[PDB]
Design a binder for this molecule. Structure first.
Ligand SMILES: [Zn+2]
Lengths: 340, 142
């Protein structure tokens, strides 16, 4: 049990330095030692990797490693990301050494000769490293070929295949932080928000809010994070399309009263011009009539639990601004007229 | 309805008039389908004077209700529409003298003196003579 800690952390240090350009002192001995250690970890993962204290100990070690590093400053080093990557650690190491230009000639030769010995060893009991890399090359080729011959960006994002993949990764990555309980998930998400591209991230959150559970604590965390952070939710509802927000809001009733409140504030900063029969905003970043109509139409074309909510929120905002029944006076009368 | 004291339904009717005035053309002489008014219910002068009339009659109700910004929008639009009636300018400048006197007022004074009846219908002539205030020129030389 304790024997595996010094094995795994040492291997992780060796792995992390694998990608780094200090390779001068390396030799066949170092490479042989690396790959036999990696075989040992891949053997552990097979033997007693499931349903024991050892699995959870290794997960504690891995996730504690990935949060003590954090991903700030001195190095945004990946590391082996999770316990499943224990079963293919050797492949990571080999790939990193093949990408390191700074590798020495004899090390390179010994490496590649140990990865790809040839068909001298066509008969093997354990799925070896050569087969693993071949299967990887096939998959990478398959992915390229499907992406550029048959794939289409589906408009119903929740049914897309990229967004669904990113989403499942995010959910798994939140589950591990939850089990760790070291730092709160909201801090990870806030750091992500600064770090990576916002437009992409928001579509991904939207999509992860709708994937059914597989262990919905993941979605349960993101709703709390969003309701806590108003600024992101201002761009959440603003950037995405209509039906996605509608399905999100119908799935999570806690997002409904704020969303209508966001829309209710965007109408109020419009002004009607008599010459062109169109509501418009003063500032350029004020939502147009067409987009706002689309949002309310999607909300009305929804389950009954939300239809009455939006309808009452519109009537109460109409009567608040004079209970007119004629256009040119109230954006809310004009909405309710256009819905029918 | 104004003379009977009903702000809401008054503004309703003025808004209905305005919608029909901007979202439709009376001078649709594409298809000669009937008997029609040759002169009275075609004149662009009648159209602009009538636009202005309805804008003013709406703005005065906004003033009564305490919505001077909307009133300003209507009066400004009437000035943009018919710059040679001066009832527009009187109402607009009274509002600007209430809210933000100096610069905008003089900016429109200069417009008036840059500017300085043909064949209108009588229902429009008489409507304007009814709504206009007696203290127009007295206020406009102030
Ligand atoms: Zn006529």
């Amino acid at each position: 049990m304790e024997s595996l800690l010094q094995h795994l952390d040492r291997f992780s240090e060796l792995l992390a330095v694998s990608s780094t350009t200090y390779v001068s002192t390396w030799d066949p001995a170092t490479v042989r030692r690396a790959l036999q250690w990696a075989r040992y970890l891949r053997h552990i993962h097979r033997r007693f990797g499931r349903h024991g204290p050892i699995r959870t100990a290794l997960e504690r070690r891995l996730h504690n490693q990935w949060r003590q590093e954090g991903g700030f400053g001195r190095g945004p080093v990946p590391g082996l990301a999770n316990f499943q990557a224990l079963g293919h650690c050797d492949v990571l190491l080999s790939l990193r050494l093949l990408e390191n230009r700074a590798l020495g000639d004899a090390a390179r030769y010994h490496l590649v000769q140990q990865l790809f010995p040839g068909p001298g060893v066509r008969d093997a009991d354990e799925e070896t490293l050569q087969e693993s890399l071949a299967r990887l090359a096939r998959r990478r080729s398959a992915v390229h070929m499907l992406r550029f011959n048959g794939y289409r960006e589906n408009p119903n994002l929740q049914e897309d295949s990229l967004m669904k993949t990113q989403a499942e990764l995010l959910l798994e990555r939140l589950q591990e932080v939850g089990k760790a309980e070291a730092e709160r998930p909201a801090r990870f998400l806030s750091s992500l928000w600064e770090r990576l591209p916002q437009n992409n991230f928001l579509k991904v959150i939207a999509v992860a809010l709708l994937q059914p559970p597989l262990s919905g604590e993941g979605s349960q965390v993101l709703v709390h994070w969003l309701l806590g952070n108003s600024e992101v939710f201002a761009a959440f509802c603003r950037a995405l399309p209509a039906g996605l927000l509608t399905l999100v809001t119908s799935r999570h009733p806690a997002l409904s009263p704020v969303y209508l409140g966001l829309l209710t504030d965007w109408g109020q900063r419009l002004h009607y011009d008599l010459q062109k029969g169109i509501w418009v905003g003063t500032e350029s970043q004020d939502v147009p009539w067409e987009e706002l109509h689309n949002r309310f139409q999607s909300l009305c074309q929804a389950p009954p639990p939300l239809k009455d909510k939006v309808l009452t929120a519109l009537e109460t905002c109409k009567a608040q601004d004079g209970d007119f029944e004629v256009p040119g006076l109230s954006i809310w009368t004009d909405l309710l007229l256009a819905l029918r | 309805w104004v003379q009977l004291g009903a702000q809401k339904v008054a503004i309703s009717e003025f808004s209905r008039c305005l919608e029909l005035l901007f979202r439709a053309t009376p001078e649709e002489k594409e298809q000669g389908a009937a008997f029609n008014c040759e002169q009275g219910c075609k004149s662009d002068a009648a159209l602009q004077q009538l636009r202005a009339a309805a804008l003013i009659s709406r703005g005065l109700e906004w003033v009564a209700s305490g919505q001077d910004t909307k009133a300003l929008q209507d009066f400004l639009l009437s000035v943009q529409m018919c710059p040679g009636n001066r009832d527009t300018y009187f109402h607009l400048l009274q509002t600007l003298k209430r809210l933000d006197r100096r610069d905008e007022a003089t900016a429109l004074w200069w417009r008036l003196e840059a500017q300085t009846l043909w064949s209108l219908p009588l229902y429009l002539e008489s409507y304007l003579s009814w709504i206009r205030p007696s203290d127009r020129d007295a206020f406009l030389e102030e």
